Amino acid sequence: NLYNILKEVTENAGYKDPDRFWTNPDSPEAQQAKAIREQKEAQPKPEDIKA
């Protein structure tokens, strides 16, 4: 939805190609970035302190 909003704004501004200023969240690079972002949430700090 945010990608669609940004696309609409960019096309209204006068730029027909929206990939020059934004990345599609469904593109494989975006999926990879989300993969590393999720992987970096493996363990927070105090949980092993708790265990």
Binding site: K16, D17, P18, D19
Partner: protein, 50 residues
């Protein structure tokens, strides 16, 4: 062509005035920006060609 030999022959200038008053605006439009034409793409796949 109806002028007499010894009388006045002054001619009013109307078409010249109208043309000379119309032309400069018609040139400022279509000339001022340096560029004269702009091609806009139809889809996102034509942008580079455009």
């Amino acid at each position: 062509g109806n002028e007499r030999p010894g009388k006045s022959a002054i001619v009013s200038r109307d078409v010249q005035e109208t043309v000379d008053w119309i032309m400069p605006s018609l040139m400022k439009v279509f000339t001022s920006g340096g560029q004269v034409v702009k091609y806009e793409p139809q889809t996102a796949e034509d942008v580079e060609q455009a």
